[PDB]
Amino acid sequence: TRNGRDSESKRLGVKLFGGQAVKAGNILVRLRGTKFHAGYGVGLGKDHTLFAKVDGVVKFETKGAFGRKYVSIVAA
Amino acid sequence: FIVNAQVRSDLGKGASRRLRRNAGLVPAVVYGGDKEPQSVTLELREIAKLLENEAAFSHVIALNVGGVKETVLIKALQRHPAKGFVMHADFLRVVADHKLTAHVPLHFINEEVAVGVKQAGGEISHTISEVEVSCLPKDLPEFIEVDMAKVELGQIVHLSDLKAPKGVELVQLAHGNDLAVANIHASR
Amino acid sequence: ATVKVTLVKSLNGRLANHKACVKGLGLRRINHTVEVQDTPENRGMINKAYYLLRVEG
Amino acid sequence: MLQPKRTKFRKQMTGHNRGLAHRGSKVSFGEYALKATSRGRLTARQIESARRALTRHVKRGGKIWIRVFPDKPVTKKPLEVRMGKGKGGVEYWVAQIQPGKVLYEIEGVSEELAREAFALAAAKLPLATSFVKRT
RNA sequence: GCUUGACGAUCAUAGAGCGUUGGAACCACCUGAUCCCUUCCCGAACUCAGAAGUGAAACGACGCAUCGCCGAUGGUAGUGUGGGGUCUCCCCAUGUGAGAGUAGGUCAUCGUCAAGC
């Protein structure tokens, strides 16, 4: 009947773009259910949050069947 | 049916709008089977005589690019929607042997006296026009004559009723459909 | 070679971005002519601020 | 009048009315048409004032198509009401016209009986509408 | 490169449909279920013991653009900065430039060994 009541905007998005250099446990993408899949050396935590495990450069490559988006980190 | 052209070595948006107000020209292209596409300027006055002609759409037109001559058939008319006038033309080279689909007008030649008109309630409603073609360019169908002087009331006309004379096919019969053409019904 | 430029408009109603393209060339005020080393990245600043300038060669 | 049967929502934004009309500017069914050369918006009672003008200057036959359909609800606040206590109720329905759009089509009549019939329907519409033929 | 298997590379120009075709090597159906083992019932599936038969089915190759899928050139829509006008909308200079549609394409291309030439 009356309607205000929004929420407080959880600050999602994609950090660490296509040519960065990452540390051991950085946050790559704050996902909301797998826009991006776990590529070569990344983690996929509890609420589908991609994080690194090794060092290098982010790739953002599209692979395979289903055309899914794979975030791999390359030792380069 | 004859028209002469030029070369148009200036592309883009800005150079393509100065043509239409300074010199009154219309852009075009000539793309075909064995050659490259070639852009072209034409005048708005000379296309106006051809577009006013009846069967000029389903007909071979010669083109003088420079002194270059080519038998050219027209399949597009981009047209200005607001005021109403011609924009760029986009026609086609004609090879002496190629399959060459195009579009053909209709006429409905004999409907002054029909069985549904003079006996029953008289209405004839033309649904379709501009039926396509798929024919070698050695024989050009300028038009197709359809006769509805004998079809009674309550009957419709499919595409199988009218015919395509002397080596002409119909693409809609090459698919699994047969579109209705004309109806005869009762007025209200 | 080089090319000389001439600041022919004022800087006091402009953006925060054209006002730094002109300062990157080295122009301080109106009717002030400098020489630039005509690299591909020094003539990229000229293409932004083309209307404040008189590129008289 | 002409309005949807049921709607997924109830009220809608205003928006704008930009651009020309590239799809909608070609005559498809009839052989004469009344296309619109000025932008505006039609309020679904003007359509019935213009339909009932064409359907009594013929009285013999022909066939009429109505190419445009209003689906955009508009609001109106009541009187002696200050501003800001919500949003007003839906009073009527609006189609949005932009230059080139074809409004009515006719066929099965003469070339000049129809020409003086769209003169009647143009005097009920708030737009500058022209006369066009099938090619 | 040709033959069949295994594992990949690349994800439709590699798909679907139709047609055609293969053995005694491979593979598949097949024969039994006593002996492992299995079925909310059932040797269907799972598994074991095998070589009576077959290439039907399946599976590979080989053809067809009929559906699908890719897709030019030109024009057009929109838009950054600077100016305009009759200023709820557009226009000029300049940089940028789709989507849709058209001409046409497509019955994929490779790599690693093991058994065949």
Add this chain to the structure above:
RNA sequence: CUCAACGGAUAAAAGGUACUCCGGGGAUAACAGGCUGAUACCGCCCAAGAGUUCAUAUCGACGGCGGUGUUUGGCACCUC
């Protein structure tokens, strides 16, 4: 600890003033002005029709474009 006035004044809290009072404010209302014209008012375009025939002697349904600031408003720029 429905401390839900959800960063939570205290273990523990309802109302009247036309008998009124002090400090302020045109950061804010009622009167008149200002900008606006939905409404109001005088008009004008198509003309189904009735005026026994005959749309325009007089009216004119369905709808459309303007003018004046005259009353019902909208806003809160001036003056507490």
Add this chain to the structure above:
RNA sequence: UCCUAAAGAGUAACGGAGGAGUACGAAGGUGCGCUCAGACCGGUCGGAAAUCGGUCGCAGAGUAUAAAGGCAAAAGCGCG
């Protein structure tokens, strides 16, 4: 949770629409298996519809709970 929100984050209105103040000792872990809805044909008391068999499917089903974003190593279903 969505829209306004201008293709990074953020962002107002007494702006348009909806939900929560919980369940669960398996509705958790693991190993092993397995696919939907719907249409249609045939089949006794059911019949537009129950259970069974069949082809067609190509996720249009499902997700303890709103909507959004997801799901074939199925994040969906069964067993130890």
Add this chain to the structure above:
RNA sequence: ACCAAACCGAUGCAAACUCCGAAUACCCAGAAGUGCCGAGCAUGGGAGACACACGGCGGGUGCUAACGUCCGUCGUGAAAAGGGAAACAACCCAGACCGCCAGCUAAGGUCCCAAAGUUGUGGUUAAGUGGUAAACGAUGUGGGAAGGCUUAGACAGCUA
């Protein structure tokens, strides 16, 4: 003789609909030049502010009404004088250290108030348009490209 799923063909439209899809804006790296001699970051001392205003471009609301009102982003006022718009915080031009009876320019201008062309060239417009306004009406006029008939006699008028 009404009606009507579903399917085929043509045909339109959504802020809470997407098979698609830019310009810009954002990030990170590698370089040349310029920075008024610094631009950045960190630690300390001292504050003021937390009533905003208009204009341009995207929007909500409103009647796509208000110098209305709530946002996004640049600009000006606030805290900026000078020249222009007759006078006109917020629009165009340009940012005042002081002195000069010195010169060249910007927007705006050049008959007289009023500083500078009664300048040159090619046409238009007779209404004081210029120097306020809509549907709509009309042998106003200038230009353009096509037509319709015509010395076999057209169009007008005068006679049957």
